Putative ADP-ribosyltransferase Certhrax (Bacillus cereus), 445 residues
Amino acid sequence: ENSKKTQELVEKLPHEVLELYKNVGGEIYITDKRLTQHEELSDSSHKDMFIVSSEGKSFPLREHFVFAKGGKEPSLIIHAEDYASHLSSVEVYYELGKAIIRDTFPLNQKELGNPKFINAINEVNQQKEGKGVNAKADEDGRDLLFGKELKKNLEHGQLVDLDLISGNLSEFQHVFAKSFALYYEPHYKEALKSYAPALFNYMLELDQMRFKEISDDVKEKNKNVLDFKWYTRKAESWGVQTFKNWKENLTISEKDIITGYTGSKYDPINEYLRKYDGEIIPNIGGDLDKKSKKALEKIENQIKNLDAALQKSKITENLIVYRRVSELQFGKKYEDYNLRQNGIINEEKVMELESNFKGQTFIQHNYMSTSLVQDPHQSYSNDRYPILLEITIPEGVHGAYIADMSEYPGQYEMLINRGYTFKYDKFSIVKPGKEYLKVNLSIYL
Ligand SMILES: O=C(CCN1CCCCC1)N1CCc2[nH]c(=O)c3cc(F)ccc3c2C1
Ligand SMILES: [Cl-]
Ligand SMILES: [Cl-]
Ligand code: NA
C-alpha cells in the first residue's frame, strides 16, 4: 500500500544512483514504525538525536520520516507514506542525495573537490542581478541552496576552493544533496534551474551521463578485484558464506589453534617462524632444558595444525586485504625510522623507502594476519600505525576468513598462509587526522 507508493518513489530515481549505493553495502528500508524503533537505529545514541530537513528545520529523529544512516554500513530508512506530497518526496531525495555524497565511494572521496562541483558552486555564489558596472548581487542561488551556517561563513562573490570545502564539509554535502533533491523532484526542478542554473547544469550532467560513467567504472573494477574498502556489511556476508564449508571441515585442534593464534599464541608462533629469515640453520649439540623443549614442541604442533587448517582453504577470486604495520615492516634497523612526526608523513623518507624497496620481493615466513576491511578496529588503526599495507591476493592463495573464531571478531581477519613471496608495488602518501603511507603489495604465486 503506502509501502508500495514509497517503493515507487525510490524507483523513480536513476538505476545508476541506486547501483552505487548498493555497491558499498547500502540498504534501503521501508518501515511502518518510527525510525528510532528500526533495527538499524537501535544504538542508545539515536534516542536523543536530531535531524535537519532540506529547508533547515530541526526535528527529533524519532519524529521524522526519513534518515540516511552513514558510516560503515549505510542504510536509508524511510517511513512508509503516500509520498504524493512533493514536500515529503523532496526530503526523501534529499537524504538519498546525502547518502550518495557522504556515504558512497567513490563520490564521497573526490566529488566535492572536483572542478565541476567547485565551478558550479562559485558561479552560483557570483550570480548578478544587473549586467553592467556595479550590478547588484543576486542572492537567489545562495538563498535556495546554501545552509544558514554556510551563508555565515561564505559571503556572496567570495571564492570557494578546496580548503573551504574541507573546513565546511557537511555544509557542502548539504548543497550537493539539496541540488540532487530539487533536480529529481519534478516540482522543484524548474526552481533549481531558474535560481541556481550553474548547480542545475552540474546535476544535469551527473544525471544524464556521469553517474552512469562512475557506475560503469566501478563495475569494471569489480570485475578485476574484490575490494570491500572500509565497509563491513558486504564483507562480513562474503566472509561468512565463502568459508562456511571450510569451517565445517576443521578439526577441534585446528579450530582451537586458529582461536589461540589470534590471542596469546600469536607472538611465539610468528617469532619462531621468522627466526632465520628462511635460511635453514639447524641447531646442533647440547639440548634444551625440559620446559623449553616442551614449549618448542608445543609451538611446532600449533604450526602443524595451522598449516593443515589453512591448506584446506583456497581464496577463489582476486581479493584486496588490509594490514597496519610499523616501519619494522622494512627490517629491524628501521625501528626508529620516524616515518611520521606530529601526524605528518615524512616525504623524503617515503622517497628512500621507495628507492630501496619498490619492486623488491620478500618472503613473509610468519602467517599473515590481515583485515577483510580497512581499519575496522582500534588495535590496528591509523592512530597507532603509520603504514597501511594494501594487499592484492590472487585467486588460489591459501587463506581464510576467521573473524568468527577470533578472540577479536571486530578485526574481520583474513588469515593468509605462511611462506608466501610478496612484492612491494607502490608507495602513496594518504592525507586525512594523521597522514599515513599506503604500501601496495601483491602476492607472487
Ligand atoms: O602484533 C600483532 C598482534 C599482537 N597481539 C595478538 C594478539 C595479543 C597481543 C597482542 N599484529 C601485527 C599487526 C597487525 N595488523 C593488522 O592490520 C591486523 C589485522 C587483523 F585482522 C589481525 C591482526 C592484525 C595485526 C596483528
Ligand atoms: Cl608479525
Ligand atoms: Cl609491526
Ligand atoms: Na597448494
Q: What stands out?
A: The first strand starts at residue 27 and ends at 31. The CA atoms of residues 65 and 88 lie 9 Å apart. The chain is about 40% helix and 15% strand. Residues 197-224 form the longest helix (28 residues).
